[PDB]
Symmetry: C2
């Protein structure tokens, strides 16, 4: 594009960002995200998906997936898209804006150093991860050089962190992605 940075979304994702969806339980939220991982893999993307939910009600605000290769954009990680699309939807660059319900980013895998920073500047007050960093590195994806004890860095900034949620289900999807090739392989790898 000439007058804008435009990252298009595939059909399943456009739908995911425009379909009403309230998922109370944390496992319900993560389960849905893993559904997005599968759909994204079939849509030429990396094995990564994430979604911003209102922390308490579980109302889905926005979802993103790895679109690095098909989108010719190394910054197009699931977290970046999810956080940015949620901000556009709520009409603010700051999800912690006064009067705004607390937001939570539910992600299929622990964040790379890039998305680590993205979470910090986003305004989200919670981060829930499925697959661990080691799980991701085991299929060729780099997390990059994150600071020492990144989880503590987030908590120290008001962002609670949960890991390992439905990890096994996520790994099955990571192992399947690796087994069946990949393509130019996403970013952070």
């Amino acid at each position: 594009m000439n007058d804008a940075l435009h990252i298009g979304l595939p059909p399943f994702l456009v739908q995911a960002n425009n379909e009403p969806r309230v998922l109370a339980a944390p496992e319900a939220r993560m389960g849905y995200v893993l559904e997005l991982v599968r759909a994204n893999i079939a849509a030429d993307g990396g094995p990564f998906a994430a979604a911003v939910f209102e922390r308490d009600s579980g109302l889905l605000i926005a979802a993103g997936t790895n679109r690095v290769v098909p989108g010719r954009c190394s910054a197009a990680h699931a977290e970046i898209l999810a956080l940015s699309l949620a901000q556009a939807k709520l009409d603010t660059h700051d999800l912690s804006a006064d009067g705004l319900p607390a937001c939570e980013l539910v992600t299929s895998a622990e964040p790379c150093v890039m998305c680590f920073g993205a979470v910090i500047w986003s305004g989200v007050r919670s981060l829930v991860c499925a697959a661990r960093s080691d799980d991701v590195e085991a299929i060729g994806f780099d997390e990059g050089p994150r600071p020492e004890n990144w989880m503590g860095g987030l908590e120290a900034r008001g962002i609670t962190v949960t890991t390992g949620l439905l990890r096994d289900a996520a790994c099955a999807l990571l192992r399947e992605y690796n087994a069946c090739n990949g393509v130019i392989y996403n970013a952070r790898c």
Copy 2:
């Protein structure tokens, strides 16, 4: 969009991305980048700008500026837009892809933790900064929790790093923004 990730670019930035331009000297490259910083401030954006140049020829590939507030996107840092717009233009998520010239990211200030990762994933082989992280955090801009010796971290990834280029002018622009960042109206601003 209310579906795709869309960050609009202000006229001056479109202009910059539209007109072929070659800047051989580092000072020339940074000088142009600092011109974008001032233009961006005048266009309701943050005091930051960056541009991707072909390292060995000086050809400008793409430029970006902080459009966080106007863009309703916390991930819209100079570096992110510059790197992404360069990739969209060359039609690839890897700036070091076979066939492409070695790229260089010239930025008005040392990268925050988010952009730190973006640089690594981008494919650029060189990073050139003006203002130091202390100058930026001096006017209240957080760089975030970068890993220890992030500069060495980059060099170990094969990305050469230079900093302090035209630091004085960069710093003056930062202070200029700060002096005018308040609610009480000042005709001189």
